[PDB]
Ligand binder design. Structure first.
Ligand SMILES: CCCCC/C=C\C\C=C/C=C/C=C/[C@@H](SC[C@H](N)C(=O)NCC(=O)O)[C@@H](O)CCCC(=O)O
Length: 156
């Protein structure tokens, strides 16, 4: 059966997502994951490569990861990505773009179960440049979401 809403425990962020999200402008080019609310060690620099039809590739923890996306019918703005890893792993992950200017930065929410019963989520800051940091345009939004000290990752 089709999965029609994000996992129980994931935040649908009703009322907190940008209006007029343009998938065509977001899912093009490269995005570097430069900061996140929660982070692991050692920090890394993941470059997310996008292609047509919600396909993406990134350099993950242990090998390249390839994902295929689709819209989540019950949750506006959300996507479900089915991913496979070069070590032979597979997982599902959910995301929504909270705010983006398409040409410089994007604040995303990500959530998934990953085989557990308790979801793991995060807020992610993507930048078009590996040297990208926290944009002035997100100041108020980050305050509203209580994201006052994003962790810098391994990009520079
Ligand atoms: C343009 C931006 C597009 C964003 C697309 C959104 C989602 C699909 C892409 C990546 C998903 C990664 C999920 C990783 C799982 S861990 C999932 C699994 N255990 C695994 O083997 N992961 C391999 C690996 O992470 O390298 C956890 O590390 C996540 C922890 C919390 C978080 O940061 O979301």
């Amino acid at each position: 059966a089709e999965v029609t809403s994000i996992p129980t425990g994931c935040n649908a962020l009703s009322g907190k997502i940008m209006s007029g999200f343009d998938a065509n402008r977001f899912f093009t080019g490269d995005w570097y994951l430069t900061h996140s609310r929660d982070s692991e060690v050692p920090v890394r620099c993941e470059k997310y490569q996008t292609g047509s039809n919600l396909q993406l590739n990134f350099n993950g923890k242990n090998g390249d990861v390839k994902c295929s996306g689709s819209t989540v019918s019950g949750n506006q703005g959300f996507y479900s990505f089915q991913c496979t890893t070069t070590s032979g792993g597979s997982f599902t992950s959910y995301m929504a773009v909270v705010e983006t200017d398409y040409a410089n930065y994007a604040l995303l929410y990500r959530c998934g179960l990953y085989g557990s019963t308790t979801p793991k989520d995060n807020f992610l800051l993507f930048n078009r440049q590996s040297s990208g940091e926290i944009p002035a345009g997100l100041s108020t939004k980050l305050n509203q979401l209580e994201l006052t000290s994003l962790n810098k990752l391994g990009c520079s």
